[PDB]
Every structure is written in structure tokens, then in C-alpha cells.
């Protein structure tokens, strides 16, 4: 099985450590699948593998014990990098109204698949990543970029349903 | 692609709905992979698929808008049943010291693969599911069955290291 699809992918991105005390392991490989497989199994890493980057140029994995939401870690844009975050370390429940939610649930509560944020079909809208930097309006993930009440939501791919809330649990239970 | 391995599998287990109003969807297939593909892609399902069960006698998927932790639903035994739970709806962060943690993390903070609980190798112990019922000492997941200071831990597959705490973040972080 290919463990690559079990990760949250963010194209053209890598991560940089502000605090350089945080450990890292690198290696040249061929495909990103190799980085995924290694990371998932965690065999060969003196730490818990939370995320990795595949350098497409150098053909190289960079395995991290941290991810984009870790303190003292910055995202950086780069044409050759693909970021892959292990979903186990992307909080899959919400605090409050869920403005900080970054998980990959992309289905509404009646079970309609979400429309991508940067598509205008079926529904036209202004909720684009450029209007909400840091709110992760990517793919078709359930989000609440304005921090409104009702929790994370999305435009549904049902022409007859403009938007619907998603059913994402609170961490409080 | 093959999604079945993206679920927490509980063997010999099904879920009975106690709440009379609760939705359930079922169909006859050959293998459980079919149930998993259907669940993940959430296709032809009037709810959000949080878990399914494969009946090996009937050769039949049962899809659920709930899982084993949902209120109004009971875990129940049967040799013919296998319970697959969508990892997006098992809290992946710990509240307090982690006694209620039911996630699938199974690596110690220093990268060691956990020894399965019901194994005696490399390390003999007494943390058997049969004397910790309710605490999900299954497979080799990090657990904290006595709710001790230190959070979830496991016995490790490394003969040199009996046990190690795991690195599972607090929901508030
Ligand atoms: O709400 S459910 O209980 O899921 N209802 C389903 C139906 O959607 C399905 O058409 C029938 C026949 O399918 S089969 O499995 O008997 O072949 O079975 C069950």
C-alpha cells in the first residue's frame, strides 16, 4: 500500500526551523512514496515522524519531528518542495468556533462533498486563499475563515445546496 | 486506491444502534475494501461516514454516521464482524493525562515501534486487554490505562528499552 495519500499535502512548500535545536533527518531517494513509507513506519528515525518534505529537484526526503503548526517553525514557499503532514498530528477536533481548524474533512453533515475553495462551480464566491492568508482555504476542506458561529463549513458540490456546515467534533467531547 | 488501511480496525466487533432514529446504510459486496472505498469517498451516503462494519458471513457493509465513542451506540462482539473507524473522528490529541485516548499512534517519543500489548516479547507484562476492559489496549497503540503522570506510553519492541512515553499533543496547543 502507498502511505503517501494518508498525509496532508501542501504543494510548493517547505518548513524552516527557527529554533535550530529541533532535530532533522535527510536522505536522497527517488520518489516521495519512499519518504511517506519511511515516515509512516517511522523505521530509521530517532524521533516521532510528524511531517516530511520531498525535494523534487534534489530528489531528497527531509523528515521532521514537527509540522507547520509547531511553534518555532515557519512555512516557506519553494518550487521544488512538497510538504506532507502526518494527519495524526493535525488536530482533528475543534476548539470553539474552529477558526484554527486545519484538518482534511471535506464532507458536509448531510454527506455532500465540498466544492474546492478556488473553484466557482457550482457556486460563485469570494472566499479565496488570497483574501484569507493563514486560514488554509485549500483543496475543498471544511473551514471557518471568518470565525463565525456554526463552525467550519464549505460550499457544497450540490448545485441546489450553496453551503452547508460540516460535522466536526469539539475536543471538549 | 486502497483506503482500508486508513482506518482503525477493531476485529470481531460491530456496533448496535441504541438510538432508534439513527441512520444506517448497507449493501452486499465481496470484500471490505469496497466498503472502505465507499466510506472514504463518501459516495451514495446520506450522512457523514465515520465508521463501517464488514460482516464476513453475510459479506456485507454496514455504513454509520457514528462510531464506537458516539453516544447512543454500543460496541458488541461477533466473530463475523470487523469494525473500521474513520481516523478523522477519533480524537488525536489528549485531554489531561490521556486515559481516554483512542488514537492509533504507536511510536515512542524517540522513534521506537511499540510492542503490542497482548504480546510478551520482548517484554513480559500484565497490561492485557482482558484486565483493562474499556481502555483499548489493542494492537500496539500508545495508551495510559491507569491514567498516570506522563501521558500515554507503551512497551517497546526494543529489548533494551522496556517502556517509553509517546509524544501525543494536548488538544490545547
Ligand atoms: O438503508 S439500508 O439499510 O442501507 N438499505 C440498503 C438499500 O440501499 C439496498 O438497496 C438494499 C439491497 O441491498 S443488498 O445489500 O441487500 O444487496 O439493502 C440495504
Chain A to chain B, count of Cβ pairs less than 8 Å apart? 83
Strand partners, A81: A55
Asked if B101 and B94 count as a contact pair (C-beta separation under 8 A), the reply is yes
Pairing mode, if any, of strands B163-165 and B60-64?
unpaired
Of A99, A167, A88, A85, nearest to A134 (Cα)?
A99
Say which residues have a Cβ less than 8 Å from residue B99's Cβ, sequence separation at least 6: B135, B144, B145, B146, B147
Residue in chain B lying closest to A93 (CA): B91
B1/A23 Cα distance (integer angstroms): 33
Asked if A137 and A117 count as a contact pair (C-beta separation under 8 A), the reply is yes
Strand partners, B8: B85
- Three cell numbers, residue B150: 506522563
Say which residues have a Cβ less than 8 Å from residue B138's Cβ, sequence separation at least 6: B10, B117, B118, B129
Of B30, B37, B29, B26, nearest to B4 (Cα)?
B37
Residue spans of the domains in chain B: they are 1-90, 91-173
Atom number of ligand 1 nearest to Cα B60: 15
From the CA of B28, how far away is ligand 1's center (Å)?
8
Asked if A98 and A154 count as a contact pair (C-beta separation under 8 A), the reply is no
Of A61, A7, A64, nearest to A35 (Cα)?
A61
Of B80, B159, B165, nearest to B119 (Cα)?
B159
CATH for the stretch B1-90: 3.50.4.10
Out of B47, B48, B93, the one facing A91 most closely (by C-beta) is: B93
Whether residue A23 lies within 8 A of chain B, CB to CB, comes out as no
Asked if B144 and B99 count as a contact pair (C-beta separation under 8 A), the reply is yes
- Three cell numbers, residue A66: 514537527
Residue with C-alpha cell 521506537?
B112
Alpha carbon A33 to chain centroid, angstroms: 17
Side-chain half-sphere of A93: how many Cα atoms within 13 Å? 20
Pocket test for ligand 1, best of B27, B58, B63 (most atoms within 8 A of CB): B27
Out of B49, B92, B171, the one facing A88 most closely (by C-beta) is: B92
A70/A50 Cα distance (integer angstroms): 10
CB contact (8 A) between residue B171 and residue A6: no
- Three cell numbers, residue A83: 510538504
Of A166, A152, A160, nearest to A111 (Cα)?
A166
Establish whether residue B24 lines the binding site of ligand 1, counting it when its CB lies within 6 angstroms of any ligand atom: yes
Q: Could you write out the three-class secondary structure of chain B?
A: CCCHHHEEEECCEEEEECCCCCCCEEEECCCHHHHHHHHHCCCCCCCCCCEEEEECCCCEEEEECCCCCCCCEEEEECCCEEEEEEHHHCCCCECCCCCCCCCCCCEECCCCEECCCCCCCCCCCCCCHHHCCCCCCCCCCCECCCCCCCCCEEEECCCCCCEEEECCCECCC
From the CA of B25, how far away is ligand 1's center (Å)?
7
DSSP string, A132-150: STTS---TT--B-TT--TT
Secondary element (H or E) of residue A76: strand A73-86
Burial class of A170 by CB neighbour count within 10 A (0 to 12, 13 to 18, 19+): middle
Asked if A87 and A105 count as a contact pair (C-beta separation under 8 A), the reply is no
Secondary element (H or E) of residue A89: none
Of B122, B107, B93, nearest to B166 (Cα)?
B107
Q: In a mutagenesis test of the A interface, which of B67, B92, B106 is the best target, namely the one with the most A β-carbons within 10 Å? A: B92
Enter the resolution in angstroms: 2.8
Burial class of A21 by CB neighbour count within 10 A (0 to 12, 13 to 18, 19+): exposed
Closest Cα to atom 1, ligand 1: which residue? B25
Please state the φ and ψ torsions of residue B122, each to the nearest 5 degrees: -70, -15
Strand partners, B99: none
CATH for the stretch B91-173: 2.40.20.10
CA distance between the termini of chain B: 33
A89/A21 Cα distance (integer angstroms): 20
Asked if B115 and B140 count as a contact pair (C-beta separation under 8 A), the reply is yes
Residue with C-alpha cell 510548493?
A12
Asked if B36 and B87 count as a contact pair (C-beta separation under 8 A), the reply is no
A166/B14 Cα distance (integer angstroms): 26
Experimental method of this PDB entry:
X-ray
Under DSSP, the state recorded for A127 is: -
Amino acid at each position: 500500500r502507498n502511505t503517501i495519500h494518508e498525509f496532508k499535502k501542501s504543494a510548493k512548500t517547505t518548513l524552516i526551523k527557527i529554533d535550530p535545536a529541533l532535530k532533522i533527518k535527510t536522505k536522497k531517494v527517488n520518489t516521495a512514496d519512499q519518504c511517506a513509507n519511511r515516515c509512516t513506519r517511522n523505521k530509521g528515525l530517532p524521533f516521532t515522524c510528524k511531517a516530511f518534505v520531498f525535494d523534487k529537484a534534489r530528489k531528497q526526503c527531509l523528515w521532521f519531528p514537527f509540522n507547520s503548526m509547531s511553534s518555532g517553525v515557519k512555512k516557506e514557499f519553494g518550487h521544488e518542495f512538497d510538504l506532507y503532514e502526518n494527519k495524526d498530528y493535525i488536530r482533528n477536533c475543534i476548539i470553539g468556533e474552529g477558526e484554527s481548524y486545519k484538518g482534511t474533512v471535506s464532507i458536509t453533515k448531510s454527506g455532500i462533498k465540498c466544492q474546492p475553495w478556488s473553484s466557482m462551480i457550482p457556486h460563485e464566491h469570494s472566499f479565496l486563499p488570497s483574501s484569507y492568508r493563514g486560514k488554509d482555504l485549500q483543496e475543498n476542506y471544511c473551514r471557518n475563515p471568518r470565525g463565525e458561529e456554526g463552525g467550519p463549513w464549505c460550499f457544497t458540490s450540490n448545485p441546489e445546496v450553496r453551503y452547508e456546515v460540516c460535522d466536526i467534533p469539539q475536543c471538549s467531547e
